[PDB]
Amino acid sequence: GSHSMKYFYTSVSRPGRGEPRFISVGYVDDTQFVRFDSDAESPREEPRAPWVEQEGPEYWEEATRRAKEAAQTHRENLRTALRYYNQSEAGSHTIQKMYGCDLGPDGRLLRGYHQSAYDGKDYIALNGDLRSWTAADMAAQNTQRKWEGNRYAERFRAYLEGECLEWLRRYLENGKETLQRADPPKTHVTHHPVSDHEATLRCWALGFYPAEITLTWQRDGEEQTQDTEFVETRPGGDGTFQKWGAVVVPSGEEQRYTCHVQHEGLPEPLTLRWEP
C-alpha cells in the first residue's frame, strides 16, 4: 500500500570530553530496525528488528562502514559549522539529519526526503523536485552552493531510485508479518469524576500500528474542542502505539458525548460511547 524508509542522525559536540556523540537510527515506516551509537562499547550497526537479523556479515560490515563514515562526516560538519557561524570550540552544538524514500503502490519512487538542521533550527533541505536545495539562513547557503557545484542531489537521487527502494522492498518482504500489518486499536471509554458536578471522559486507543491515528470528541454530534485534552501518540514499548483523548463533561450529560477514532487498521471509523 504505502511504505517508507528513513534514516536519522544526531551529532553533539562535547568540548573537553573528546569526540562528539553520534547516534543514528533506521526506520521502516514506524518500525526501527537498526542502530549505531558512537559511545557503544563496540560501535557498529546493530539489529533492532527480528526481521533484519537474517542479513549476512556483508550487510553489517558495509552498514557499519557507512555509519562510521557518516560520523566522520558529522564531526567535519560540526567544525565547518563552527566556522560558518563563527562559533567557539568551547561550546556545544548539535547537527541533525533525516533522509529517506517512499515506495509507491506501483513499486516506484513516490517522494524523497533529505533535510538537515543545526542547533534545533532548519539548516538545509532538499526540495520536492529532488533537484534543488533550500537553505534556511546565510551560513547554509555556503552548503547550498557547494552541493550545487558538485551535483550532490544527483547522487543522493541515484541512491533514492536505487539502493533505497531495493532494500526497502527487501525489508518489507522479510518482515511482512510485522511491516505489512494494520493492527486496529483496542479502544474503550473510561469515566473519571473531577468533582461533584464534573467528570472527565477519556477515550483510549491501544496497541495500534502504524502510529497514524485521529481521536476526536463530539457533543450531540457536533465537534468539541472546548475543555479537551489530546496527548501525543506514544509507544507501548513492544512495537505498538497508544493515544487517548479526554473531555471535561457536566455530570448527567455523559451520554451526549461520543468518541471518534480513525486508523487505517479499522474497516470504518469507530463511534464509542461510555459503557458503564
Binding site: 557507512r66 562526516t73 560538519n77 557547494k146 550532490y152 543522493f156 539502493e163
Partner: peptide, 8 residues
C-alpha cells in the same frame, strides 16, 4: 541501506 552522506 544507508546513503553516503557528504560534508557541509
Amino acid at each position: 541501506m544507508r546513503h553516503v552522506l557528504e560534508p557541509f
